Amino acid sequence: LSEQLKHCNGILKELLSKKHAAYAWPFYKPVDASALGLHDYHDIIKHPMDLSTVKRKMENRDYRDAQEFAADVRLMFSNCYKYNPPDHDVVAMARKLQDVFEFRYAKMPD
Ligand SMILES: CNC(=O)c1cc(C(=O)N[C@H]2C[C@H](O)C2)cc(Cc2ccccc2)n1
């Protein structure tokens, strides 16, 4: 990985770490719409994204730069903000994990 992709991989490891598990857990795996009774999820969310998919893409060297990595992490949060009412617990958890993401992503090495 490049220096910027190593910074991205470090962020990914932190988002998956026990440190953030209390609010990160809804983003660990793809939303199982059927299991959760969310029969409109795939009509509203055209591009599902989650941290296990980001991890697989990082492991497969799919991401060519930090911008591509950040686009998937932000897509995951955007899906949450699009599908859910803004007062839902999952949105509070998305905002908290996105705060962790944005502040560390901003420390990208130049
Ligand atoms: C990324 N996951 C989700 O978007 C999601 C959605 C919904 C859900 O039921 N949404 C509907 C829309 C509105 O009518 C309520 C539930 C969960 C699981 C969860 C529950 C409680 C707390 C944290 C997660 N995750």
Curated annotation (Swiss-Prot):
Where would one find the signal peptide in this protein?
Answer: none
Q: What are the subcellular locations of this protein? A: Nucleus; Chromosome
Enumerate the spans annotated as Bromo domain.
Answer: 1-108
User: What's the domain of life for this entry?
Assistant: Eukaryota
Q: What does this protein do?
A: Chromatin reader protein that specifically recognizes and binds histone H4 acetylated at 'Lys-5' and 'Lys-12' (H4K5ac and H4K12ac, respectively), thereby controlling gene expression and remodeling chromatin structures. Recruits transcription factors and coactivators to target gene sites, and activates RNA polymerase II machinery for transcriptional elongation.
The text of the family note is: Belongs to the BET family.
Please tell me what else the database record remarks about this protein.
Some specific inhibitors of BRD2 that prevent binding to acetylated histone are promising therapeutic molecules for the treatment of cancers or inflammatory diseases. ABBV-744, a small molecule, has been tested on tumors with success: ABBV-744 antiproliferative activity is mainly restricted to cell lines of acute myeloid leukaemia and prostate cancer and is able to displace BRD4 from chromatin. GSK046 (iBET-BD2), which specifically inhibits the second bromo domain, is a promising therapeutic small molecule for the treatment of inflammatory and autoimmune diseases.
Assembly: Homodimer. Interacts with E2F1. Interacts with (acetylated) STAT3; promoting STAT3 recruitment to chromatin. Interacts with CTCF; promoting BRD2 recruitment to chromatin.
Relay the domain remarks: The first bromo domain specifically recognizes histone H4 acetylated at 'Lys-12' (H4K12ac). It also specifically binds histone H4 acetyl-methylated at 'Lys-5' and 'Lys-12' (H4K5acme and H4K12acme, respectively). The second bromo domain recognizes and binds histone H4 acetylated at 'Lys-5' and 'Lys-12' (H4K5ac and H4K12ac, respectively).
Put simply, this protein is called Bromodomain-containing protein 2
Give the organism the record lists. Answer: Homo sapiens (Human)
Name the gene: BRD2
Residue window of the full protein shown = 346 to 455 of 801
